Design a binder for these strands. Sequence first.
DNA 1: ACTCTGCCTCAAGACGGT
DNA 2: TTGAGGCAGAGT
DNA 3: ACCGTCC
Length: 335
Amino acid sequence: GIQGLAKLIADVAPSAIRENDIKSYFGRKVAIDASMSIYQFLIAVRQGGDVLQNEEGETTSHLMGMFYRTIRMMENGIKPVYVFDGKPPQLKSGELAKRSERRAEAEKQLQQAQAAGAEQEVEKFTKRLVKVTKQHNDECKHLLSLMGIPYLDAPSEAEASCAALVKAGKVYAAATEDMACLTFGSPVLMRHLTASEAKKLPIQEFHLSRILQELGLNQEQFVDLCILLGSDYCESIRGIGPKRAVDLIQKHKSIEEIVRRLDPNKYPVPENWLHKEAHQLFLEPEVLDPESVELKWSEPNEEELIKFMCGEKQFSEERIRSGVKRLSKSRQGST
DNA sequence: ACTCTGCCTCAAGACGGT
DNA sequence: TTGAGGCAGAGT
DNA sequence: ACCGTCC
Ligand SMILES: [K+]
């Protein structure tokens, strides 16, 4: 994430966002952040406050979500490649650790809810306690393998590896809600791509070059701006938000300069501010080699699919086999 | 009055059958 | 996790 | 569209 970046671009660079109907992404490949979508499902796919599961106790909401949305996308001519998060950059420790503490917090607030009724709390805190695990990951990779859908492991940050794939032309765009993908230099970002039957929000397409033009910056100044707005990798200056940050970056072009010209009594900066290191992470992140693996959208293995989902995970053979045929079908073509 | 902060709420997908 | 949106209040 | 259920 980059705090407020979406609203900012809407506000001061509206020409950088197009809204298109899904019909116009027909025949395009997109890169998807696996870990974020798995998360979205673990949160949303709930039956009675609880997550879907086979009786052995193993979770399955993520498998549901992934299987079906993937199929939908494929039907609409959208070939998705899933990129899985690698090892988090050191600069991320801070953010990550906060995320642990809050979870611990939630967990305590779980007990005091359970021992006092009102499942409103129980389910709220339970949602706040959601966490993607290496198991979730391994399972989804298996599923995608048996669906013929290609997946890649990012050495570190998935978003950075997505931006790398779009840069290299291996895909048209990155489909994610994480504005940071632009910071890492991805020329095109697509929010709200679900290929879902109930629509909801219109697909949003962000062009990086348009953002740059409309804001009057180059990529480097744009990274600095995102750092000021609020990145996952270092702190921000208290009291400088979107409006002020745009002003300052437009006037002084860099963080060093900005820090020289700032009144240290009105706007004091953070102590031991790793902003230069963050910046360098954004310009030169560790990413996979987009030329190593040639992405192929294979044919589903229907039998093995039934064995895995239906067999191991108690999925209705009819719903599954139906999905498998919609997908095998969409491979040869169609609507 | 503009801006930011921080504390809060609240919600989070897809399908099949009407 | 991400919003959007709500509000009080401090600080300009 | 609504909504009961998917597991
Ligand atoms: K800030």
